[PDB]
Each structure stands twice: as C-alpha cells, then as structure tokens.
Design a protein around this ligand. Structure first.
Ligand SMILES: Nc1ncnc2c1ncn2[C@@H]1O[C@H](COP(=O)(O)OP(=O)(O)O)[C@@H](O)[C@H]1O
Ligand SMILES: Nc1ncnc2c1ncn2[C@@H]1O[C@H](COP(=O)(O)OP(=O)(O)O)[C@@H](O)[C@H]1O
Ligand SMILES: Nc1ncnc2c1ncn2[C@@H]1O[C@H](COP(=O)(O)OP(=O)(O)O)[C@@H](O)[C@H]1O
Ligand code: BEF
Ligand code: BEF
Ligand code: BEF
Ligand SMILES: [K+]
Ligand SMILES: [K+]
Ligand SMILES: [K+]
Ligand SMILES: [Mg+2]
Ligand SMILES: [Mg+2]
Ligand SMILES: [Mg+2]
Lengths: 528, 528, 528
C-alpha cells in the first residue's frame, strides 16, 4: 500500500551503524561512578535529568529511517535488559554497539553471517557458564550495603537505608519507593495489617491528639456484605456491651440506619465502637477479608461459601486485636490474637498461589498480603528540593533495589566490568566448528573488554591501558575508577550482581548478532 | 515516535547558558529598592506591569529548545522559591544563574560533575547552618513594620498597615488582600462571626439607616435541615414571644410555608424575627453550624448524631447574642453568650485538626473558623487608580505579608544581601574530600556575593567595590542602596526573613548543581 | 507554552513611545472647539464619524506588539477617564502621552524610576488640592447652560435644551438621550407614572382621537397575581358599578375568562373598565406595584406578606387617579390621590436603598422609580438627517449631560485648560525628597501646559506663545480659541467641571508614571 525504499549491502549497514553509534554514544556517557547525566526535554513540563540507560535509550528517535531502525534495535536491547534484570542497561547498550560494529566489518562476500551469529551465541553461552562458575553467594548484610551503594552511584546513605530496610523486613520483603516532600530520605516500616480505609463518620474519635480512634484488646467483626439492617448489627453490639470491650466493624459499607444507631449509642452511652470500609474492590477484597479473619481469629459474615448470618453472631466469632488505631485516611490492626497454625497455613497458601501463574498484578497483591501477614512492608520517601532532583534520586534508588534483589537471588561477582574481563581466558578453550564460528568467538572476545574500557574512559583515563593492566594483574585486583587506582575489589566493596551482568550480555549478544545478518533493508518512504 | 535532536558536550551547555542568562537578565532588573518593572503582554487585555521575580520568570518561553530547557529550569527555581517561602524569587534566580555559569566552565574532561554537585550541597548546608546560627528572633512590632516596609519596596504605608493588622488580629491571624476601588489602602477588621448569607425576604427590615435588621440580646436557633413544616417552627416562635426577645433562624433554607408564617407574623404582631441561610455547602456547613452553636451556646437541630427534633425545643436550647445585624449580602453575630470552656475546647479541636494532614483547602477553612472564633479576620483593600497599578501594589502587599509571616516564624537577618556575605568565612572552614568538592566549595563561595553585587549594580554603582567594602567593614555595617551609603542595617531597619534567604539559596543550588551535570541533550525536533 | 520576544532598555521604550504617540496623535485632533472629527471604519455597515476621545482610542489596535502595548495603556487611560467622569478623555490622553514622553528621556543609568513616579504622584496630589481649592460651586441655571454649551462643542441649542430639562425635572433628575427621526432636537417630559404596558383587548377604547382609553377620577385595583377566576374580579366590578366610577385593573395578566367577562360587560352595559399588564419582570415588578399602590393610595392584592385576597375587596382598597390614559403601547396615571406622608416615606426608602450597594442596574431602577414618584423623567430626541449625524450629535449630547452632572456635583473652574495652568505656581512650593522627586515634579510642571497648547494648536495658532501670554496675563484672563482672542472666561462662559479635570489628570498621571518605569518588555511572538 505504501511505497518503500530498498537499500542493499554496505550502505544500509553503514546507516544502521550510524544510528546505533549515535544512540550508544548518547547512552554511554552515563556509565561508571564518574558518568554524567542526560537532560531529556519533556513536551508538557520540566525536562528530565536522568542517569538511567533505558530512560535515555527510549527517549531517542531519529528522522532517518535506517538510523531509526538501528535505534529501535538498541532500544529493544536496553528495554529487555531493564525489564529482565532491572540494571545494567548501559552495559547492555555498549555491548550491543560493540558487537554490531565488530560484526559489520567482518561481513564479506564469502563470510557467512548466520554461522558467525551461531559462534557468537556459543561464545556467550561459554562466558555465561564461566560467570556462573566464578560467582559467590551473598551472606552478610555488609555485602548488601556494598551492592546497594555501588548500584546507587556510590551513595552511602542509600545503601545503608536499603540494608536497614532489608534487615527489618527480610531479604525478600516488600519495599516500595516514592517521592518525599522533605530534604533527606526517610524509611518507614508498616507492621501488622494496615489499609487505606478511614472511619466513616467523624464521631468515633476519642483521643486527645491526632483525632483518631484508639482501642486496646478490641473485638473485630468482619462482614463481606453491607450493614444496613438494625437486627444485623444489634446482637454484635449486645455481645460487645455485655463483655465491655471495644468493637470494630469492618465491612464494605455501614449504611445510614446502622451508622445512626452506632453514632447515637456511642454518643449517648459511650459504647466504644468504630466502623471501617473493607479494603479492596474485587476478589482481592474477599482475600483480604479472609486474611484479617485468620490473623485476628474469627469468621467472615456473609461469605458465599458458608453464609454465616450476622443474626447468629457468637462471642467466639469476633476477632481479638491487641491495639487498633483508625484515622481519617487509614486504619491499622496490631497484635491479632489468632492461632499461629492457621496463619502459617494461610501463608503457605499465599506462597503456593504465587507459584501457579502470573498476571503482572496478582503477584504484587499476593506479595503485599504475605508481607502484611508476616513482617510488614517498607516505604522509602526519597527526599529532595525540586521535582527533577527527586525523580533522579528515585530512579537511582529503584536501580539500587533491583540490583540488591538480583544479588540476593543469584550472587555477586567483581564489579567495574572486571567480571567479564576474567572470562576472556574461558573463551580460549572453545573450538569453533568453522571459520565463521572463529570470527564470532573473536568478536565476543574483543567485546568482553568494552565495559571496563568505557568505565575508564568516562573517568578521564585511557581505557585500553587500564584494561591491559587489569588483565596483567592478579586474579582479584581490579581498578577503582572513583578513586582512580588499582585496588582489591571485594575488600573495597565494588561488586555487581551476576544476574545483571549475564542478562545484559545475553540480551545484547542475542539482538546484535541477529542485527549483523542483514543484507537488504526495506523502509517506508517518508511521505510526511 | 517523534524524531529527536541530540547535542553533545559544550554546544548544549552554551545553549542552556544562553537561555538561563536571558531569563535571569530579564528577572534581575527587578531586584533591590532601585529595581525597575517589567511589562508582560497579556493576550486578552491590558499588559501586566510587575516587579515580581516568579511572575517575570513564568511568563518567559523561548523558541529554541535548549534555551527553553534552561528557561524551564530557572522557572522551576523561581516557582519553588515562591511556593515555599513567598519571597526571594529574584535572589534565587540570580543565584541559580551564577551557580550554573560558574559550574559550566569548571566542567572538563577530567572533572567529576557529580562530586562537584556534592561539594556544592555540602557548602550550601554549611552556609544554611551559619545563617541559622546568626539569625535573631522578632520581638517588637517595630521590626514587623521594618520587615513589611523592606519587602514592599520601601513603602512605609504598607508596612504600617500590615503592622497594625497583625497587632489588632495577632501575629498568626487571618489577613487577606483584595483590590480596592479607592485611591488609598484601607484596613478592615471583622470581629465575631460574620458570613456572606443575607436575609431571604425583604420584610424583616426594622432599621432607619442601612436597610438591615438590627437586634440586641437575641435568641438564635440553628437548624441543619431545612425549615418547611408549620409545627417545626411554631414552638420556637412561642418561646420567643413568651420571653419577648428577638429571634434568628439560621438554617439551610426556610421554605415558603415557614417564610409566609414568619413574615406575616412579623408584619401583623411585630414579632422580632429574622431568617438567614446557613453558610457553607458541604461538611464545612456542618462545622460552621457547630461553631456558632458553641459560640452562642445551644444545639444544632437535625444533626445526624443526636437528631434533636425541632418540635421539642426548649428555652435553654437557643443561643444568646448580644447584638446581631443582617443585611442584603451578609449577617454578623457579636457577643455570643457561650461558655468559655467549650469555646476553648473547640479551638483546641480546630488547631488539632490543623495538624493531622493537608489538602490545600482544609487548612484555609480551619484557619478561617479559628479566626472567627478567637479574634476575627483582617482584609486589606489595596487602592489605586487603574487596574495595573492595583495589581502591582497587590503583588507587593502579598510579598510583604509572606515575608512578614516568614520573619515571625523563623527570625530575621541583615538585609541587602549581606546575610549571605557574612557567611563566606564559614565556607573557609570546610574541608573538601577531593578536588571536585573543592571546586564546588569555591563555586558557592563566589556565588555568595551575587545578591549584593546585583543590588548595588541596579542602584547604578559598581557592585564589586561595594561588596569588597562591605566585607572589609565591621561585622554589622552594611550598604543602603536606596540612600546609597554605608550605614547600620539593624538600626536603619534593612532586615530580611532568614527563611526566605535560606530557602532561595537551597532551591537555587539544588536545581543549578543538578543542571551543571549534563553532557548530552535530547530535544524534540521543532516540526511545527 | 508560547515563545516570547524579550526587549531590553531603550528599544522597548522607543517602540512603546511610538505606539503611544500614534494613538495620542490620532486622538488629539479632536480637542478644542476647532477640533476635527475621526472616521472609523465599521466592519458591518456605515463608518462612524466621531469626535469622542475614548471612542477613537478604543478603536485603535496596532500590529506591532510593543506599539500595541503602548496603545493598550493609553486605551486604559481613556477608558478609565470616560467611565469615571464621562468627559475629558482627550485631555487625559494628551496628558498621558506628555507624561510618558517626558519621563522616558529622564530614565538613565543612575535615575530611579520608582522615586520619579512617587514624585509625580506627589505633584499630582498637590495640583488636585489646588484645583479643589480654586473651584467654585454652580448656583444659577445660566452656568448650567454655559457648561452644557461648552461640553457640546459650542452648541447653544443643546445647552438650552439641557438647561430647560434640568430646570423642569430638577438638577438631579432622570434625563435620557435617544435618537430622533426628525431634523431638530426635541425635549419630552413624562410626569406622574407611565409604563410601557398597553391594554390587552382592543375593546376598551372609548375616545374620539388616539384610539386610547381616557378616564377621569378612576378607581385602580392592583393585583400582583394573575386574574382568571370569575369570583376574583366580580366584587371589584360590583364596587365600581355601585359607585359609578371607571375602573382600572393592573395585574400580571387578565386571563381569558375574566377578560371575556370584562369585555362583555363593557360592551353591553357600558361599564367603564380597562385592563393593563403589570410593569417589570422580576422583583422590580413588585417594587413598581407597591409604588403605584402608595402613589394612588390602596393595597396590592396577592402579596406574599399579607395575602390580601381579592374576594374581600373594599371600596377603600381601590386607589383614586385624577386622569388615566392607556394606549396600544403604554399607560399613564396622573393625579394619584395618595397620602403625601406615605409617598415621602417611600421616597426616603428608595434613596436609602440607593445608598447600600451597587449593581450597575439597581441604581438605574431606583432612580427611575424615584423620578416617577417625584418629578418625572426627561427624554431628549436627538434629531438629524442620516444615522451617522444622529450618532455624532447623540455622542455630543451625552458628553454634555455627563459634564453638566459633574459640574453640579463638584463645581466649575476656568475652561480652555487654564485651570491646570493656574496650578503651576502651586508646584513651585513643593520640596522634593531627592533628585528623582525633583525630576517628577518638573515633569508634572511641564505637562500642565499640554491641554492649553493642544487647544491652541488645533485652532491654528502657536500654542507656546498663547500659553506664555496666558501665564503673564491676570489671574482670570484666558484665551478663547473659537474667537481666537484673550478674554474673560467666566464672563464668556468658558468653564469646565472640576471633577472632569481632576479625574483626567489623576488617571493619566497614574497610568503614565507606572508605564515610565519599564526596563524589560516581554511579548508573545506573532505566530499568526
Ligand atoms: N568506584 C568504582 N570503581 C570501579 N567501577 C565502578 C565503581 N562504581 C561503579 N562501578 C562499575 O560501574 C558500573 C555502573 O554503571 P551504571 O551507571 O550502573 O550502568 P548500568 O546501569 O548499565 O549498570 C557497575 O557495573 C560497576 O561495576
Ligand atoms: N534600602 C535598601 N538598601 C539595601 N538593600 C535593600 C534595601 N531595600 C531592600 N534591600 C534588599 O533588596 C532585596 C529586595 O529584592 P526583591 O525585589 O524583594 O527581590 P526578591 O523578591 O527576590 O527578594 C532584599 O533582599 C533586601 O535585603
Ligand atoms: N471657545 C473656547 N475657547 C477656549 N477653550 C475652549 C473653548 N471651547 C472649549 N474649550 C476647551 O476645550 C476643551 C474641550 O475639549 P473636548 O473636545 O471636550 O475634549 P475632552 O472631551 O477630552 O474634554 C474643554 O476643556 C474646554 O475648556
Ligand atoms: F543504567 Be541502570 F539503570 F543503572
Ligand atoms: F520577588 Be519577590 F516576589 F519580592
Ligand atoms: F472627548 Be469627550 F467625550 F468630550
Ligand atoms: K546508567
Ligand atoms: K523582585
Ligand atoms: K474629544
Ligand atoms: Mg546500575
Ligand atoms: Mg521581595
Ligand atoms: Mg468633552
């Protein structure tokens, strides 16, 4: 339907190389402890000052169609590396550019690009095997702090904050990051169960400070359906008054009749009672209701399974909470007097439901519920002066969290790009099946030095000399670019998650090797 | 999706410097007592003649994308300074331009911009600590008048007006500014409770002048619900007639039946009675109703809590007001015979609700209600001939109010920019961790002289010589630019709110240091 | 969002001065008795030939943004002068141009424009005080005729017409101006009460000429509600027939049943009765109904206050009118037999409601009702041949009316611009606080000669020489430009309202002084 432009041979390869080098030159200035930032113009408001590889990559589009194709492929590399590992986007970008450039000149009339790509994949598999062999697990929280600091552009405070959060909530807890209105970063831990549903009427407040409702050793009644009937809520009030204990009513909604009854009773006779809307809007609402039922110890009234009617409420059907506070925006429950066996079984059920399928939203909810049941969640308020600074620090903190999670899951290797450098001798033991596989192995061997050279170059020193000295040094000595000297990497804490390195290398090679097999390019003619 | 233009290194930095210099040159002519005004064309009507830094900054947009980026960053600086402190926008703008300019040449191949930024923040923290140490609190109203006069471009009348308003309403009262139709500024004080709800029917007027309804020692009946039934209003009239006292009915609305009853009775038997709509349209209506119930002393009929029906009204359920007037637009209640303990408890509840959360609208309503309860509010009618003069004087008056509030909250320091100048020796005691931190400290030290130099330059004298003489002077002697001589600031009343200075410096540094770390710029190609 | 063009220093000032000079040169040719007219093209129909300063000013817009800014400021001057005083728009325009031009060259590197503006305002205040001191009140109608003649471009007929109208309706009566279909101006006076509501059915006509309904000593029944029921109108007819007197039914509408009854009775038995719709469409309808009830003497049936039902009508509930005529378009009531005390009290109430607030419409209605009650209303039919001539004469007549009202309210001073000239010695007694205030005082002193110079220049003589001779003349001798010779102003009747002069000077100085403080001008780039 649309007329096309077709380009053959070396011209199209040169145009793709131009586009790829432009994108990777823009990205590569954000690599290493001495890397600089990139300012991307935002059409609506203030420009974004960022040091993230994938953010810079995704914001670059070129007018020329062939350079646009190269840019799109590099963007695919960066996006895959970001979505799989969460870090090492610039490393993947520079590796992709290096592989593409090295493979482009190796293409000749007699060369076989497909076999070159096969050899490249074979060499990458060997390098990944060596990386897995030479990695070591993470044991002490000091290594966690070191990994977080390295991934956060050498910020000690962020590393300490993340290490403290992981110590307090567990190495596989739920940690979230959001902007803070203050100057310095803050960490808060939410324990027990707390949901963003406040009290309905401003008449249950019985506190001097905070204008909240605080109860200790309180009854809890959970209703899956709404509360409107007089006889649907009176017997619970009778039980609470007879036992002389405060009562909480958590439901979808308390209707006007029951609201009037509760408010009138609390104002006249001083009956300690409060009402809270049920968190969640779908099946998650029912799951959370069952979760607080198990945690406090009781039953859900109005469930489709048993249909426990509210009229036949019993004193043993009400949960016991050690301390509950509810304010205008959210309510929390602490010290639920529930049996530990049922809580453990519910936790096992949640972890089992975490391992049946994925929907990009159900895993998050399951993790949230599990954290609320076991150890609570952690929230990081990222401080700053203006919006751009806060956004940049937030991106750095998210990168640090992703890298720390990867290091926990898989382990650590030498930082600074030396982990790939130590894998070069592993490539000397490979036997290519033919000349093209030899070419691919040589391409990967040459590419393995790219991250260290780029890191050294951003520091202002000659990358090749630093790489050569690293190779001629011991099996552990590496180069500290921030200090600018040859030091002990593991002692100085310059370490990287092995998952990030292997993922970046794998994705970059997988895309670049396929890219280097092109001979003919068809593009849409730029009519507009 | 949109093709981009990518610029590397010094060219993009030069373009940002051009944009920042243009915006800050436009803004900086509005600095000091001898600064001049800027005319901004308005698309709809008359142009705006303004001397406000943020107003000039936000109205400047540039065609070139990189100059636009620099302008947007400086606009962010000015906007943050305006929203946080309310004054010192031009100071923040000139500081931001100076920091960006000084940091741009310091960027080199071997320089580390991130460490330079870290050193800049360290130096700014030290300067802020010194500023906090050397500030002093505000004690006498004379200092309030001096601060208001300085912030209002040396206008004695505005300073005296603001000082009188704060004396008669309290240093933390509710003072608002609105345009006046006369030539000179006026100050009006509203005491007691007064809301913009006039009488419904023009038949309760019983005054010779003003065509209002005037009562003394009057009963007050407050109904949250509408008044329509005959039986819902008759017993209150019976109580009023038996006690032979005037009666006010404040409610959402008095319906036609009850209006007919009240009006016809008042016309026939001369029953002193008036009807007023309840102020507020949401929960604020209920809060205000409860507030006047506590102030006058009584109860709200029809509340959802107790549901005090109007049929069972008692003589002790009606509030007593010493003197109440109501006219076509608003009604005023004075001398409510309410118990002081309940009023104090309500005030405590208001101030507690002021300190739970923020919504940018609830704080204003809470402050309004608290002022109506305790001391009333003040309104400043800014006079003038045309609209442009009134707008300019209104901007100056708002700046004076913001500066006076900041001075009350935090304290005062030497004016004329010497407060930052005296902090230069504090920077000599800082030890940089490396060379880049030393560069950042030097940048901040050089930037600290910018406000005084700009103020002197706008006066027509050489800024550098004046700054040098100030540094070589005593620890207190400063330069009066309006008089143009070296004098005593604290004696002459040239003082500045320390909050304004510290906020402007902090925001300007925080944005400019981040800006000076750019190496690559991606902008949208100007297709249209 | 929109790219801006920013101009600094002398260039922007020069462009704004160019725009101001263009607009004021266009306006200033319409000044003095020998001034000429300006033709403004109307997009829809015939062009407007006008001699009004504000009409010429408001119709001028310039393509260049800076010249447009200057034109907008001069338009603000002219509009404020027109809306406040009603005359002296050209004087204000020329004063504004002179002040802006004089202040623009006084701006230098060392000058302080704000202090110059302060000195200008001080000098203007002194001049206004002198003008108020030297003015004299208006006592005789001859001065009224002189003022109207001077303000109407020296037209004796218009002055005599306005003087006669003010003699016959009072110096503060209601006089309106509307176009006439004849050649010469006419003055019509409406006495008593007359409203534009004619008889409904063409069956009550009982006159030989005019096809109206003429009655003497007639009963009047006023109903706020509609008349539809048979029993709602029969008893009034019984009373009228028993007393054998004509009857008028003034109501919102006489519906089909009652209208048919009235028509049938009047046609068969010759019952003298007529029906008229109530004037007004809102609360004004009720106010007018009450006013006719008070003037005639009676009550309004169906009012929401007392609800006087029409069934219980009494002979003392019907007003008595000496003569009532009603035609196809309007009805007139004369010689209402109402008690003078109630009429006086209603008049006092109307003047009191005139002094509570303003809504730009309610004052007009109150004045109309007061005039209808007390003395009547005057209407001026402005005659002419074509539409343009009628519009020009209408503009001149409105200017004369505004000037005469101002002279009545405040007083008169010497005309021809000598009133400002005599105020120059008052400026010699002012002591400036500094050099800039001295410059402002000199600017005002130089500007004070502009109106007389412009008036002389339009006459074809040298303005400077005429002004100089005026200054060296006596304290009363002035220059008649129309006669072109030096005479006695008060004897020759060349006088001006002091309010017009002071308002024009104040507004022009206030806007121009603010304009002369600009250093930077920011405009929107002309994209389209
Ligand atoms: N002080 C240091 N000395 C040497 N290498 C470092 C130092 N700090 C960080 N690095 C290395 O630099 C890399 C950080 O690059 P980064 O900007 O995170 O790019 P990416 O996000 O693509 O990993 C890490 O792989 C780390 O090994
Ligand atoms: N008479 C004076 N002599 C010396 N300095 C002054 C004088 N009046 C004001 N200043 C200084 O000038 C500054 C006023 O600048 P301003 O136009 O308010 O800019 P901003 O609104 O950004 O503070 C204040 O910081 C004050 O210290
Ligand atoms: N015969 C005359 N001799 C001298 N001055 C006159 C004469 N007639 C009018 N003037 C002066 O000319 C002015 C009239 O100008 P006009 O066209 O009304 O401009 P504006 O509408 O701005 O007042 C008046 O101020 C009056 O004093
Ligand atoms: F470039 Be990654 F996001 F650290
Ligand atoms: F520049 Be600020 F608003 F005084
Ligand atoms: F110019 Be004015 F309307 F006489
Ligand atoms: K990066
Ligand atoms: K300013
Ligand atoms: K004119
Ligand atoms: Mg990283
Ligand atoms: Mg200020
Ligand atoms: Mg005139």
């Amino acid at each position: 339907g649309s007329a096309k432009d077709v380009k053959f041979g070396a011209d199209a390869r040169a145009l793709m190389l131009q586009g790829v080098d432009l994108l990777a030159d823009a990205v590569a200035v954000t690599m290493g402890p001495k890397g600089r930032t990139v300012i991307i113009e935002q059409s609506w408001g203030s420009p974004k000052v960022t040091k993230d590889g994938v953010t810079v990559a995704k914001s670059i589009d070129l007018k020329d169609k062939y350079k646009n194709i190269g840019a799109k492929l590099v963007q695919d590399v960066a996006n895959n590396t970001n979505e799989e590992a969460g870090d090492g986007t610039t490393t993947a970008t520079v590796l992709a550019r290096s592989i593409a450039k090295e493979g482009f000149e190796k293409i000749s009339k007699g060369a076989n690009p497909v076999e070159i790509r096969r050899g490249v994949m074979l060499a990458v598999d060997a390098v990944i095997a060596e990386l897995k062999k030479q990695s070591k697990p993470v044991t002490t929280p000091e290594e966690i702090a070191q990994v977080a600091t390295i991934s956060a552009n050498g910020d000690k405070e962020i590393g300490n904050i993340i290490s403290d959060a992981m110590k307090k909530v567990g190495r596989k807890g739920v940690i979230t990051v959001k902007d803070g209105k203050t100057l310095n970063d803050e960490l808060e831990i939410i324990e027990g169960m707390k949901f963003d549903r406040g009290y309905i009427s401003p008449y249950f407040i019985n506190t001097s400070k905070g204008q909240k409702c605080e109860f200790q050793d309180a009854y809890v009644l959970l209703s899956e359906k709404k509360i409107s009937s007089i006889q649907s809520i009176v017997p619970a009030l009778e039980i609470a008054n007879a036992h002389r204990k405060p009562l909480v009513i958590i439901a979808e909604d308390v209707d006007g009749e029951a609201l009037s009854t509760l408010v009138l009773n609390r104002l006249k006779v001083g009956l300690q009672v409060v009402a809270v809307k049920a968190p969640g809007f779908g099946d998650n609402r029912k799951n959370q209701l069952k979760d607080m039922a198990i945690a406090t110890g009781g039953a859900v009234f109005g469930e489709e399974g048993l249909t426990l009617n509210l009229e036949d409420v019993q004193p043993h059907d009400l949960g016991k909470v050690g301390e509950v506070i509810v304010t205008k925006d959210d309510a929390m429950l602490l010290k639920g007097k529930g049996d530990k066996a049922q809580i453990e079984k519910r936790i096992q059920e949640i972890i089992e439901q975490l391992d049946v399928t994925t929907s990009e939203y159900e895993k998050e909810k399951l993790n949230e519920r599990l954290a609320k049941l076991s150890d609570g969640v952690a929230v990081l308020k990222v401080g700053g002066t203006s919006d751009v600074e806060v956004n940049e620090k937030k991106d750095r903190v998210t990168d640090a969290l992703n890298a720390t999670r990867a290091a926990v899951e898989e382990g650590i290797v030498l930082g600074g790009g030396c982990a790939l450098l130590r894998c070069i001798p592993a490539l000397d033991s490979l036997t290519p099946a033919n000349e093209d596989q030899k070419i691919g192995i040589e391409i990967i061997k040459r590419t393995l030095k790219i991250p260290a050279m780029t890191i050294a170059k951003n520091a202002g020193v000659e990358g090749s000399l630093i790489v050569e000295k690293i190779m001629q040094s011991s099996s552990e000595v590496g180069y500290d670019a921030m200090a600018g000297d040859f030091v002990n990497m593991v002692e100085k804490g310059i370490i990287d998650p092995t998952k990030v390195v292997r993922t970046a290398l794998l994705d970059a090679a997988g895309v670049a090797s396929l890219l280097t097999t092109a001979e003919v390019v068809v593009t849409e003619i730029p009519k507009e």
